[PDB]
């Protein structure tokens, strides 16, 4: 066996390579790369030994069964889908949340998680929005950007980090802010907050909520 080699045909456009068949034929040196033509486990027992079937026939059969589906292609699971991000959402961009209890608040975009959801912070001390996931379709990307290129976001802050844990009821069960989250909030905030205060009137801008008022029309105004 040999180590995999990166494709020698760069992509020109999706589905079309840069090089033709004969061009690739030479690049791959195919002129010299020519080539020519358990179900049971035995166990001892206290007979002497028994041949044991690893998988047993069903003990039941429903009266009816559905047939097998026809085969398709291109229907991937969610985890294998490509994630897209609006070009207007770069790290350090200020976004306006449009849904949930934090609607109208202006928050700082940190990064896009593997699931495709965005990660944002208020920061908490400015508008009481913590490290929280938000969906890009439900945010307005303003044109205001702070430079958070030097901010080290903890690497454990992943989709699994922010996934909700189920709470059971038989009265009521209350969510609790784990001490780890508080520690993570301070670590990230301590780096973003000084950079927000570098821009005049920006911390006050982040404290203030977005709302439409008389005569103000979203299609007319720049964000």
């Amino acid at each position: 066996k040999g180590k995999p080699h990166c494709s020698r045909n760069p992509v020109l456009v999706r589905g079309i390579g840069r090089y033709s068949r004969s061009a690739m034929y030479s690049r791959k040196a195919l002129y010299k790369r020519k080539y020519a033509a358990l179900a049971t486990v035995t166990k001892p027992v206290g007979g002497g030994t028994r041949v044991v079937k690893l998988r047993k026939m069903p003990r039941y059969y429903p009266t009816e069964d559905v047939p097998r589906k026809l085969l398709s292609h291109g229907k991937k699971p969610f985890s294998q889908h490509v994630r897209k991000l609006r070009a207007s959402i770069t790290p350090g961009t200020i976004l306006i949340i449009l849904t949930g209890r934090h609607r109208g608040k202006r928050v700082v975009f940190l990064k896009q998680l593997s699931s495709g959801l965005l990660l944002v912070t208020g920061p908490l001390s400015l508008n009481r929005v913590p490290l929280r996931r938000t969906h890009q379709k439900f945010v307005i990307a303003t044109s205001t950007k702070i430079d958070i290129s030097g901010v080290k976001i903890p690497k454990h802050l992943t989709d699994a980090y922010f996934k909700k844990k189920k709470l059971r009821k038989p009265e009521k069960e209350k969510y609790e802010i784990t001490e780890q989250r508080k520690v993570d909030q301070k670590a990230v905030d301590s780096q973003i907050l000084p950079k927000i205060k570098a821009v005049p009137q920006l911390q006050g801008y982040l404290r203030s909520v977005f709302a439409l008022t008389n005569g103000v029309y979203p299609h007319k105004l720049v964000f």
Partner: peptide, 4 residues
């Protein structure tokens, strides 16, 4: 035959 040539290909192989």
């Amino acid at each position: 035959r040539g290909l192989r």
